Design a binder for this molecule. Structure first.
Ligand SMILES: Nc1nc2c(ncn2[C@@H]2O[C@H](COP(=O)(O)OP(=O)(O)OP(=O)(O)O)[C@@H](O)[C@H]2O)c(=O)[nH]1
Ligand SMILES: Nc1nc2c(ncn2[C@@H]2O[C@H](COP(=O)(O)OP(=O)(O)O)[C@@H](O)[C@H]2O)c(=O)[nH]1
Ligand SMILES: Nc1nc2c(ncn2[C@@H]2O[C@H](COP(=O)(O)OP(=O)(O)O)[C@@H](O)[C@H]2O)c(=O)[nH]1
Lengths: 39, 44, 428, 51, 54, 434, 428
């Protein structure tokens, strides 16, 4: 669905890291990700 | 008409302040000058 | 040189201060990667107020980034100016806020506050003289209320002679994003009162009203809502960052605006604002600035100054301007509106002027107002708290985290004991 | 009555005896006075001139 | 200081947002926001044809 | 043998200082580098040759907050002021006399008194200490008091004038000004000599009407205050007919102990266009200094009586035309004068025509500067009191002062002595009826 | 320097003001883009009466366009001189008056007047010496009557010493565009009496009389009918806007035109009017201007002055012209027609001469007349009202909005109280 969010997605406040390409609204919990529990 | 306020609000606590400049001679001379102060400041 | 330690708690505070760092790095010429590329030498003259110098000519913002949900830190790190903050300063915990003041104040929030204070102590003892602290949060909800007020208390106890500005987003009457906004706001205002020195109440009602009536946006969203708060954040801390005539920093605003220690709740405003259709119809001057500052459409709290006398007003102008216009317009406001200002503070308007305006703009001005009208903001929260508290609604988890009824009663009593002074000073 | 409470608070308060700090340079560099040697502090001891 | 004293100052000043893509207007100069949807009508048309097609 | 140490304290000061020392320079030639472009010793009154042909200003700019002084350490005149004569600090003084005479002010006092001593141990004959400040600000009201008092402890009965920005009669740029102002007058009432007073609102109008500047800033005003510091010091820099030193302004003005607040007023303050139609003659220039629309301190001199007025004619002023003018002004029954002062008009006729800074004001071949001590300054002290009381009544904005070192009581002792001052202006006014 | 805040009520008032602003923009040389393209420096001498300056040399009218329907704002914005007004003072309402004085005065009018008063307060604040206000409205119909009179009352409350010029389209007998125009006119004449300073009664019937017989137009339009009105608007307020000898502004005309504090209804007339087939046979001079001005066919109200006594007459000539001819062509009228003039005021004619003529014309004149014959209009409206009121009709949708029965009775009582002091003076 083409939305206002998906247009302004790399500038929105509550958007995580866009590592993939189709949806910028995926979840990229890689920075948080405490160092003992990380791959 | 543009009416005037009375004297500006000063403290009623600080209206009893004594002198720090005794420029005048004797005390009766001082009140006789201040009688003219009242009467001449009264307009006309 | 003076510097300010910036703190941001909660999703609201994190996003607002992210936009704030975006705004102020735009002002200071700092790129996303942290280095400097600008045009004037008057930008690095006072860059050590918000940016710690690193190796290779890099400027890392001095900010402590606190939240209990491990997604808002991720969003801040992935934002526009994400690769500019210290990774160590991203302090968090894999837990939940649960929009709960008890869960932010007597739980894992208190288990995270020690690491947060370690980071704060690093940035506060990497100094020579610290002016104070600048915490951004939202009262309605968790983290920003719980962690925010707990951090407020411990930082105030550790550093007792430094200025402290809290930008608090306070719950809104007509619409509420969370149910327990009155509970959180009532429990947070009690800590706000007898700790901080300058509290800025920003309301989403007034933010959306500036978006609709003044700016005429089509789809306003949280980026623009935080942009409007970053307006006044930049406007207040400008005299200690850029030169001016008749400078005034944080403490010199606080002295002129806080007549009594309980009264420091302000209503911010920023007023070279106009819609894109009305942009070419403008006549940008200092009288137009004062006209937009002193109306009740630009002030960023849902409190009408028509319902209360102005205790103190401060106007921090930013541009090359004549001081004659500024002095005569601030006199003209006081003279044309007589019943809206208190009589026991003669000439209750303060003036500051900085020379360098915000970039891309000829001339700006920010407004701060301590008024009687901060009545309603605490009152509506008090009746909503009383309504939800008479029937014990949404409270079993509040007592499950380790609270008592008497703390709620004390919070309501202190809300009322804040309301009564701003009742009585509004009636001579 | 908050006027009377604030008035009593400011009436019945002693201020600080503030901490003595001195500035040496033109820039503003502050230094504490007691810990620096530029003050009589250890002259007035109890073991001066006596074992 | 004739710049702040010129009778013809307003005849040489420029509006803050003279055009829709002014180079002066930035995040600091608060005359260009993000919620002002220039792409509103084209976005609605794109959404409507998407709805249609799907 | 006619040097004058100047201690500029506070934004106002540092800023009037910039204006004052620019005029000082353009007058003696000293370029914005010291090196005078000669290829003689008059400059000594304000400058001190190093021998390498560098003339260093004899001043001590002091401001607890940076910014203002820092823009002087990086500007046109960045090589004139010896670094250690521009003494700034780190933290401000939040418009709080308290943190200017007690806390963040008693730290810079040691170093400033230090610099002042070195700029004194090089003088072959000091005339006095011209202190420039603003009655309404931390450093302006705080550091000045401490500086003034500590000076008296050292330099004892040495002259110490005080050019000041008196609180405004309506405008004001602070909410706590009234307090700082009353506190300052109290600590300096017995420690200062002749404190000259220039209100800003006044200069603002004098600039909109006489100098055709619709939107005046602080610089237009500052530069006019520099012309006044010139006339007051002109005699001890240029030759004339009736020289007036900086020890006579304390004797031929300050009448009785406390009363020491002369008021300033300049002459030929015209504006090019309106100077192609004016004979700016000694009489015109003088009558103007006594007009109740030029007094650079909004205080209608008509609502009071003159106590002592010392005129200073700078330029081509035939001595006879001066005697004539003062006579005419005396006859005029509008201008009043106390009885205990038969002779109340002092005259100083120097010769160097007013200097033209590449900026504003006309090139006049004649100009006067009056410094009267009108009893009409009483209204101002009353207005300051209304303000101090409207707030002291609810002990408003006092937490900040008790929050530094000012024991609540001090506020009372201050306004109480300000009430004494007002009662004094009543006595010095009444005319013996005998 | 003086200023005139121009406000427009109703569809008719908005169209009248649109043509007025086209006329003034042409007269001062302002193009539809808002900037200046002129031939003389006298156009910019007093342009700060109807316009305020903006950036880039762009002059904006100080007009507040007010309507209760969002359909006339769109037409004015889509008009020729549409991109010259501010986008903010297009104060509309998402409602409809529906031809109702009740719905103009005691309903949605009551909360749209607050926004209009905010706009008018801003416009009057941006004026150092405001001469007054100029409202264009139609008496017969909604919006212009109810909201117009409510706005008049509240502006009188806010500003007491400023002139109020009210151009009122009084309804005609011959043709009717609204059935309830007697109720609207009767309720509006009372508030026009007990408020304003000058009221100019323009009539659609007399505008058609002028456009059919004098101009010899074939198919006249509302553009032409508004053009005739805008001509006398400029002719009245031209002496304060252009230099000349024997100047007379609004207050001078009011002082010399009302003998008594209620008698401020006038009969305008602008008559250097020629047909296009009669322009090449015109001998335009001073006696021709006076005779066409004083003929009882170029009047703008259906009040034949030969049935009454001219209480006072004022005339504002425009052009370079001879003063014996000025005085003599009015003395000739005053002595030739002695029974049409009152005897208790000798020499009852006021003269003004503006130097700058209307462009495209060599020489013009405008007329203001206070006469006994204006009572004809009020007897006619009173007879219409007493025809419709005795059957208690068209009345449920006047009493249901918040009015009362007796309100119509005191409106009619004051309406016939106007009957006395303009008949007593007509019969000495
Ligand atoms: N000519 C001139 N007058 C000034 C200037 N700045 C301030 N003033 C006047 O002085 C008053 C306050 O100035 P100051 O007392 O010097 O301010 P300060 O002591 O440096 O205190 P802060 O800068 O606020 O920390 C104002 O009310 C002004 O009227 C200036 O730059 N030039
Ligand atoms: N100005 C602004 N307000 C926001 C933003 N995001 C959220 N808010 C406000 O934050 C409030 C709730 O935040 P909260 O639940 O306390 O977040 P938490 O602290 O992480 O639990 C809502 O009422 C929003 O109005 C933003 O980006 N900008
Ligand atoms: N002169 C002139 N009169 C007009 C124009 N448009 C409408 N009118 C008059 O306005 C009357 C009806 O308008 P009205 O219903 O009162 O509009 P409203 O005030 O918005 O309710 C008609 O009788 C017309 O004579 C115009 O463009 N010019």
């Amino acid at each position: 669905p083409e939305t206002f969010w998906i247009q302004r997605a790399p500038q929105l406040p509550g958007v995580s890291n866009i590592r993939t390409l189709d949806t910028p609204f995926r979840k990229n919990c890689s920075f948080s990700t405490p160092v003992p529990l990380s791959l | 008409p543009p009416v005037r306020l009375d004297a500006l609000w000063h403290m009623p606590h600080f209206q009893k302040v004594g002198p720090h400049l005794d420029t005048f001679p004797t005390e009766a001379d001082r009140q006789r000058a201040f009688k003219a102060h009242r009467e001449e400041c009264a307009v006309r | 040189m003076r510097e300010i330690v910036h703190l941001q708690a909660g999703q609201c505070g994190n996003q607002i201060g992210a936009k704030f760092w975006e705004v102020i790095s735009d002002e200071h010429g700092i790129d996303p990667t942290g280095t400097y590329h600008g045009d004037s030498d008057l930008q690095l003259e006072r860059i050590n107020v918000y940016y710690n110098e690193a190796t290779g000519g890099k400027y890392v913002p001095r900010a402590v980034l606190v939240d209990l949900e491990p997604g808002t830190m991720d969003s801040v790190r992935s934002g526009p100016f994400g690769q500019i903050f210290r990774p160590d300063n991203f302090v968090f915990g894999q837990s939940g806020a649960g929009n709960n003041w008890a869960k932010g104040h007597y739980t894992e929030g208190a288990e995270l506050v020690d690491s947060v204070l370690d980071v704060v102590r690093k940035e506060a003892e990497s100094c020579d003289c610290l002016q104070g602290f600048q915490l951004t949060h939202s009262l309605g909800g968790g983290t920003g209320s719980g962690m925010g007020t707990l951090l407020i208390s411990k930082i105030r106890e550790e550093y007792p002679d430094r200025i402290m500005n809290t930008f608090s987003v306070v719950p809104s009457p007509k619409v509420s994003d969370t149910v327990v906004e009155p509970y959180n706001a009532t429990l947070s205002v009690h800590q706000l009162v007898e700790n901080t020195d300058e509290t800025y109440c920003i309301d989403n009602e007034a933010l959306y009203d500036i978006c609709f009536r003044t700016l005429k946006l089509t789809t306003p969203t949280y980026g623009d809502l935080n942009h409007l708060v970053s307006a006044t954040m930049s406007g207040v801390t400008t005299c200690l960052r850029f030169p001016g005539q008749l400078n005034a920093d944080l403490r010199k605003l606080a002295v002129n605006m806080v007549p009594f220690p309980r009264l420091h709740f302000f209503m911010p405003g920023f007023a070279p604002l106009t819609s894109r259709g009305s942009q070419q119809y403008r006549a940008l001057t200092v009288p137009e600035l004062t006209q937009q500052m002193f109306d009740a459409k630009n002030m960023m709290a849902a409190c009408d100054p028509r319902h209360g006398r102005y205790l103190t007003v401060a106007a921090v102008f930013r541009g090359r301007m004549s001081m004659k216009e500024v002095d005569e317009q601030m006199l003209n406001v006081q003279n044309k509106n007589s019943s809206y200002f208190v009589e026991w503070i003669p000439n209750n308007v303060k003036t500051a002027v900085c020379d360098i305006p915000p970039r891309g703009l000829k001339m700006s001005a920010t407004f701060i107002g301590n008024s009687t009208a901060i009545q309603e903001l605490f009152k509506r929260i008090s009746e909503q708290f009383t309504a939800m508290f008479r029937r014990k609604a949404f409270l079993h988890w509040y007592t499950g985290e380790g609270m008592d009824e008497m703390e709620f009663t004390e919070a309501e009593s202190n809300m009322n004991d804040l309301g009564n002074p701003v009742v009585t000073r509004g009636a001579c | 009555n908050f006027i009377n409470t604030n008035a009593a608070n400011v009436i019945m308060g002693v201020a600080k005896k503030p901490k003595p700090v001195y500035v040496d340079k033109r820039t503003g560099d502050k230094h504490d006075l007691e810990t620096s040697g530029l003050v009589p502090k250890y002259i007035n001891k109890k073991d001066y001139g006596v074992t | 200081e004739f710049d702040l004293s010129d009778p013809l100052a307003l005849k040489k000043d420029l509006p803050a947002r003279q055009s829709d893509n002014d180079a002066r207007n930035t995040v600091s100069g608060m005359q260009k926001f993000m919620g002002e949807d220039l792409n509103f009508h084209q976005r609605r048309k794109f959404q409507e044809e998407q709805n249609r097609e799907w | 043998q006619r040097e004058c140490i100047s201690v500029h304290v506070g934004q106002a000061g540092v800023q009037i200082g910039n204006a004052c020392w620019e005029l000082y320079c353009l007058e003696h030639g000293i370029q914005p580098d010291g090196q005078m472009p000669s290829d003689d010793d008059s400059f000594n009154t304000f400058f001190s040759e190093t021998g390498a042909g560098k003339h260093v200003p004899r001043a001590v700019f002091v401001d607890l907050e940076p910014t203002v002084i820092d823009e002087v350490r990086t500007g046109t005149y960045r090589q004139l002021f010896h670094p250690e004569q521009l003494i700034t600090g780190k933290e401000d003084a939040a418009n709080n006399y308290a943190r200017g005479h007690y806390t963040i002010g008693k730290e810079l006092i040691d170093l400033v008194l230090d610099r002042i001593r070195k700029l004194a141990d090089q003088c072959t004959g000091l005339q006095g200490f011209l202190i420039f400040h603003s009655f309404g600000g931390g450093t302006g009201s705080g550091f000045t008091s401490l500086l003034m008092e500590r000076l008296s402890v050292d330099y004892g009965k040495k002259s110490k004038l005080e050019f000041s920005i008196y609180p405004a009669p309506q405008v004001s740029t602070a909410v706590v000004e009234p307090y700082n102002s009353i506190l300052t007058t109290h600590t300096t009432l017995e420690h200062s000599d002749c404190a000259f007073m220039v209100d800003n609102e006044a200069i603002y109008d004098i600039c909109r009407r006489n100098l055709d500047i619709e939107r005046p800033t602080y610089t237009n005003l500052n530069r006019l205050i520099s012309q006044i510091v010139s006339s007051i010091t002109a005699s001890l820099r240029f030759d004339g007919a009736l020289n007036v030193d900086l020890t006579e302004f304390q004797t031929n003005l300050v009448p009785y102990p406390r009363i020491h607040f002369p008021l300033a007023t300049y002459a030929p303050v015209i504006s090019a266009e309106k100077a192609y139609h004016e004979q700016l003659s000694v009489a015109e220039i003088t009558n103007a200094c006594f007009e109740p629309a030029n007094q650079m301190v909004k205080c209608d001199p008509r609502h009071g009586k003159y106590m002592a007025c010392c005129l200073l004619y700078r330029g081509d002023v035939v001595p006879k035309d001066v005697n004539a003018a003062i006579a005419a002004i005396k006859t005029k029954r509008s201008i009043q004068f106390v009885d205990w002062c038969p002779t109340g008009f002092k005259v100083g006729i120097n010769y160097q025509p007013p200097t033209v800074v590449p900026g504003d004001l006309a090139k006049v071949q004649r100009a006067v500067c009056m410094l009267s001590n009108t009893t009409a300054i009483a209204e101002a002290w009353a207005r300051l009191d209304h303000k101090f009381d409207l707030m002291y009544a609810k002990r408003a904005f006092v937490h900040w002062y008790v929050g530094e070192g000012m024991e609540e009581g001090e506020f009372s002792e201050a306004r109480e002595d300000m009430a004494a001052l007002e009662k004094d202006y009543e006595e010095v006014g009444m005319d013996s009826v005998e």
